[PDB]
C-alpha cells in the first residue's frame, strides 16, 4: 500500500535518493553511497525535501543534477509508529522491493544542528548479505522501470 522507491541520481555527486510514502508525500533522504544489505554497514542518508508521489516513477534528466533512474521500487511498512518515529529520529520498517527487502532502520543523529543527518542500516534477517560477498549496487545496477 505505501509506496517506496530508490532513484539512482547521477548528479555532480552520484547518490541514491531513498523515498518512503507517508501522509500523501514521499519522505526522502539522499544516500550518497547507496543502500547496503550488510547490517554492519551504516550508510549516510541526508534528509532532503518531500517529493510528490508521482515522482516515484520519474526517470529522466534534472537540471542543476543529471540523469535519474528508478533503481528500486515497491512498498514499505513501518514496524512502529512512523510519525512518532520520524519526529524522534528512529524509523524501523520493512521493505517489499525488487532489490531491497527485509527489515531496515533509519536513525537520526541527536546532535543540534545536524538534524538532517540520518544513517540507513539493514537489520539482521534473511535478506541481509555480507558486503564482501554481495554488493547489491554492483550486482543489480539497472533501472527497474526501463531496462532494455
Ligand atoms: Cl530480530
Ligand atoms: Mn538527488
Ligand atoms: Y507528534
Ligand atoms: Y523480481
Ligand atoms: Y539488468
Ligand atoms: Y546497465
From Swiss-Prot:
Q: What is the effect of changing residue 51 to A?
A: Loss of nuclease and 3'-phosphatase activity (in PE domain)
- Annotated phenotype, changing residue 17 to A: Loss of nuclease and 3'-phosphatase activity (in PE domain)
Which residue numbers mark the site Transition state stabilizer?
Answer: 51
| Region annotation (3'-phosphoesterase domain (PE)) ranges | 1-125
Consequence when changing residue 9 to A:
Loss of ribonuclease and 3'-phosphatase activity (in PE domain)
Q: What is the effect of changing residue 19 to A?
A: Loss of nuclease and 3'-phosphatase activity (in PE domain)
The effect of residue 50 to A is: 57% ribonuclease activity, 50% 3'-phosphatase activity (in PE domain)
Q: Which sites bind Mn(2+) 1?
A: 9, 15, 17
Q: What is the effect of changing residue 21 to A?
A: Nearly wild-type nuclease and 3'-phosphatase activity (in PE domain)
Query: Where do transmembrane segments lie in this chain?
Result: none
User: Domain note for this entry?
Assistant: The N-terminal 3'-phosphoesterase domain (PE) has 3'-ribonuclease and 3'-phosphatase activities.
The family line of this record is: In the N-terminal section; belongs to the LigD 3'-phosphoesterase family. In the central section; belongs to the ATP-dependent DNA ligase family.
Summarizing the function annotation, the protein's role is:
With Ku probably forms a non-homologous end joining (NHEJ) repair enzyme, which repairs dsDNA breaks (DSB) with reduced fidelity. Acts as a DNA ligase on singly nicked dsDNA, fills dsDNA gaps (3- or 4- nucleotide gaps, prefers a 5'-phosphate at the gap distal end, prefers dNTPs over rNTPs), has DNA-directed DNA polymerase activity (templated primer extension) and DNA-directed RNA polymerase activity, adds 1 or 2 non-templated rNTP (or less well dNTP) to ssDNA or blunt-end dsDNA (primer extension). The preference of the polymerase domain for rNTPs over dNTPs may be advantageous in quiescent cells where the dNTP pool may be limiting.
Query: How does this protein assemble?
Result: Monomer. Interacts with Ku.
What more does the entry say?
LigD has variable architecture; domain order can be permutated, domains can be independently encoded, while some bacteria lack the 3'-phosphoesterase domain entirely.
Entry protein name: Multifunctional non-homologous end joining protein LigD
What is the organism field in this record? Answer: Pseudomonas aeruginosa (strain ATCC 15692 / DSM 22644 / CIP 104116 / JCM 14847 / LMG 12228 / 1C / PRS 101 / PAO1)
What is the name of the gene encoding this protein?
ligD
Q: Which residues of the whole protein are included?
A: 34 to 185 of 840
Amino acid at each position: 500500500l505505501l509506496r517506496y522507491c530508490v532513484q539512482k541520481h547521477d548528479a555532480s555527486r552520484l547518490h541514491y535518493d531513498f523515498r518512503l510514502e507517508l501522509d500523501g508525500t514521499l519522505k526522502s533522504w539522499a544516500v550518497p553511497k547507496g543502500p547496503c544489505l550488510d547490517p554492519a554497514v551504516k550508510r549516510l542518508a541526508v534528509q532532503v525535501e518531500d517529493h510528490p508521489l508521482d515522482y516515484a516513477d520519474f526517470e529522466g534528466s534534472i537540471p542543476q543534477a543529471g540523469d535519474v533512474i528508478v533503481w528500486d521500487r515497491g512498498a514499505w511498512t513501518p514496524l512502529d509508529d512512523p510519525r512518532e518515529g520520524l519526529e524522534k529520529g528512529h524509523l524501523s520498517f520493512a521493505l517489499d522491493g525488487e532489490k531491497l527487502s527485509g527489515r531496515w532502520h533509519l536513525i537520526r543523529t541527536n546532535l543540534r544542528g545536524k538534524q538532517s543527518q540520518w544513517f540507513l542500516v539493514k537489520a539482521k534477517d534473511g535478506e541481509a548479505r555480507s558486503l564482501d560477498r554481495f554488493d547489491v549496487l554492483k550486482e543489480r545496477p539497472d533501472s527497474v522501470l526501463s531496462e532494455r
